[PDB]
Amino acid sequence: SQKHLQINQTFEELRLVTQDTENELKKLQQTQEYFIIQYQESLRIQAQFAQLASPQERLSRETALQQKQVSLEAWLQREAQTLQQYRVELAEKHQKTLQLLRKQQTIILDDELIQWKRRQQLAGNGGPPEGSLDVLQSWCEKLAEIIWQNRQQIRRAEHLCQQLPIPGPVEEMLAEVNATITDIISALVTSTFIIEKQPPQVLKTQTKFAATVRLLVGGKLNVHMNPPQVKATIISEQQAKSLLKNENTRNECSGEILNNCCVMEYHQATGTLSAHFRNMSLKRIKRASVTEEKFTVLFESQFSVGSNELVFQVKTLSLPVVVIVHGSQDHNATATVLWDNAFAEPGRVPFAVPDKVLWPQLCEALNMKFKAEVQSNRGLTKENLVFLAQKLFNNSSSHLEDYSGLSVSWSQFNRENLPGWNYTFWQWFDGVMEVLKKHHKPHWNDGAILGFVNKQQAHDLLINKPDGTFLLRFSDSEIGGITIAWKFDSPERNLWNLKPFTTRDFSIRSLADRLGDLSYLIYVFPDRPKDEVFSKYYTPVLAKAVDGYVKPQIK
Numbered sequence: 001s002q003k004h005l006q007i008n009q010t011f012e013e014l015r016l017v018t019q020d021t022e023n024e025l026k027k028l029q030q031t032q033e034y035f036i037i038q039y040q041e042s043l044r045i046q047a048q049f050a051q052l053a054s055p056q057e058r059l060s061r062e063t064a065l066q067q068k069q070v071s072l073e074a075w076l077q078r079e080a081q082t083l084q085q086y087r088v089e090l091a092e093k094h095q096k097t098l099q100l101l102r103k104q105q106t107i108i109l110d111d112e113l114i115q116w117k118r119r120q121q122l123a124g125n126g127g128p129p130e131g132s133l134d135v136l137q138s139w140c141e142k143l144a145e146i147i148w149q150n151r152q153q154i155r156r157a158e159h160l161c162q163q164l165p166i167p168g169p170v171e172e173m174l175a176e177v178n179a180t181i182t183d184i185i186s187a188l189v190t191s192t193f194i195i196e197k198q199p200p201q202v203l204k205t206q207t208k209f210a211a212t213v214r215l216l217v218g219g220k221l222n223v224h225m226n227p228p229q230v231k232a233t234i235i236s237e238q239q240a241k242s243l244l245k246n247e248n249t250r251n252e253c254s255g256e257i258l259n260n261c262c263v264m265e266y267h268q269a270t271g272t273l274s275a276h277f278r279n280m281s282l283k284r285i286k287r288a289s290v291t292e293e294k295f296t297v298l299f300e301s302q303f304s305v306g307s308n309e310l311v312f313q314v315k316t317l318s319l320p321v322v323v324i325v326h327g328s329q330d331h332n333a334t335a336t337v338l339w340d341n342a343f344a345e346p347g348r349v350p351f352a353v354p355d356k357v358l359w360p361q362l363c364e365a366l367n368m369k370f371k372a373e374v375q376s377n378r379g380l381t382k383e384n385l386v387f388l389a390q391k392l393f394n395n396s397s398s399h400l401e402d403y404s405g406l407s408v409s410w411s412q413f414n415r416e417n418l419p420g421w422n423y424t425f426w427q428w429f430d431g432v433m434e435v436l437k438k439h440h441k442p443h444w445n446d447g448a449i450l451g452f453v454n455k456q457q458a459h460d461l462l463i464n465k466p467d468g469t470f471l472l473r474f475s476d477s478e479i480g481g482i483t484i485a486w487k488f489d490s491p492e493r494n495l496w497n498l499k500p501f502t503t504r505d506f507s508i509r510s511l512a513d514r515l516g517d518l519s520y521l522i523y524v525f526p527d528r529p530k531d532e533v534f535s536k537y538y539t540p541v542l543a544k545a546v547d548g549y550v551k552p553q554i555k
């Protein structure tokens with residue numbers, strides 16, 4: 001990888017300095033224990049002076065006992081300042097380790113984890129998959145091991161201090177180290193409670209749904225031994241906003257979810273601690289445009305780490321969800337989700353989005369969504385984007401760079417209607433994706449549908465072509481309509497436009513079968529023979545058993 005090597009180098013340095021301070025601490029314990037024994041030897045001198053009944057040998061033993069006393073008192077005094085100096089040195093080393101650790105955690109949590117979440121958010125719009133949490137968990141486990149080893153080293157150092165107090169700067173250094181450890185652990189625990197698999201963002205009521213919540217530090221802390229219950233709740237955008245500023249009622253919810261409790265399972269030979277909610281269902285939704293109303297599944301859990309007196313209340317909000325009830329609401333609910341996933345700013349307050357965006361930014365969102373909806377690598381070309389910009393901005397320019405600095409508001413996108421129509425831009429664009437997705441994925445993928453050309457453009461492309469040359473185009477006046485533009489010289493007219501076919505027409509007779517019926521359609525623009533493009537789709541009429549055919553037979 002690239003910057004991942006520097007992260008791994010910092011982990012190896014943190015591992016080394018943590019081992020060094022463990023070695024210094026064992027030495028500090030031994031120095032203090034030997035000092036305690038030597039202090040008791042100085043008390044043993046005074047008892048020895050009271051044990052000389054004896055006659056002439058009393059003077060010889062007294063002079064030696066006094067010399068031992070002088071040397072031991074001088075040793076004890078030097079050792080007391082050595083104990084002091086080593087405590088300060090150990091505390092300075094712990095401070096240094098915690099500062100390097102804070103910088104490393106900042107990279108993992110505010111950079112790498114945020115990028116993974118942004119990829120997850122964009123995947124909701126058709127973007128490339130976030131990928132596995134394997135390296136994030138591997139990094140978080142190391143942060144947990146290093147913070148924990150350092151915490152138990154400083155608690156051992158504190159215990160040596162309470163057993164043999166030496167007043168001075170050490171107490172303030174230890175208080176500062178304890179405040180630092182407490183901040184690192186809380187940030188790590190609260191930030192590694194993440195949603196691995198988001199619930200659906202266009203959420204239909206009474207529909208079984210799933211979500212997976214994982215705790216990246218579960219394996220390396222005392223959490224997997226007593227796996228906590230995770231509770232899912234649906235809350236409104238306002239309730240989510242109040243929860244973030246801690247100004248909430250502690251129970252506010254906007255509906256009920258069935259099978260909303262789940263105990264995290266620990267998977268050994270992976271180290272993963274996760275709650276797999278597989279059978280959730282929105283039983284009811286409480287409402288305050290319904291299709292613009294955002295909710296979030298709040299996941300919350302409470303667990304302790306290593307000790308009774310160390311409990312965390314973790315909370316994580318899913319990506320905003322639009323709740324629907326009928327299915328016909330999915331199309332408008334999708335626009336709200338699309339704009340949010342694409343244009344949410346980092347560090348925003350629960351579910352704020354920019355009012356307007358630049359046309360190239362919207363292009364990137366529509367192309368991503370289009371490719372995922374039609375399941376093709378054939379997305380929106382520069383010419384398709386120009387056609388869409390012309391429809392949106394009511395502009396004539398055929399140059400994509402002329403739209404680069406133009407902005408599109410949420411209202412121009414899915415509120416106000418296009419120039420002379422009773423529909424919005426999004427309704428039209430989603431009408432195209434829906435008619436393609438429903439019946440024409442292989443035709444779109446094959447290049448059989450030009451689509452994003454206007455009536456005048458189709459006219460100019462077909463004028464000088466042989467009779468019977470045609471193209472398939474998206475209708476301007478009918479949502480989800482596909483119209484045939486064709487050239488065929490006749491006294492009354494040479495360039496023709498067929499009345500659009502919609503999903504109802506396609507359900508009665510497929511596009512390819514209708515094209516096969518029209519004998520005046522001979523070449524698909526530019527020069528491809530019709531049967532070469534559509535014959536694989538023609539229906540081979542099958543005889544029926546009700547008509548006496550005992551075996552499958554084509555008529």
Ligand SMILES: CN(C)C(=O)CCN(C(=O)[C@@H]1CCCN1C(=O)[C@@H](NC(=O)c1cc2cc(C(F)(F)P(=O)(O)O)ccc2s1)C(C)(C)C)c1ccc2scnc2c1
Pocket residue numbers: 455474475476477478483496497498499500501502505
């Ligand atoms: C009758 N059967 C069985 C057929 O399939 C034959 C084809 N057919 C027709 O001939 C229909 C019947 C009425 C006239 N007609 C036409 O096609 C005639 N054309 C038309 O009636 C029209 C052409 C356009 C083009 C657009 C447009 F370009 F897409 P837009 O971008 O929105 O401006 C919009 C509305 C119309 S109405 C034509 C060929 C001049 C004769 C037709 C076409 C589509 C449908 S959908 C349901 N019935 C039909 C019938």
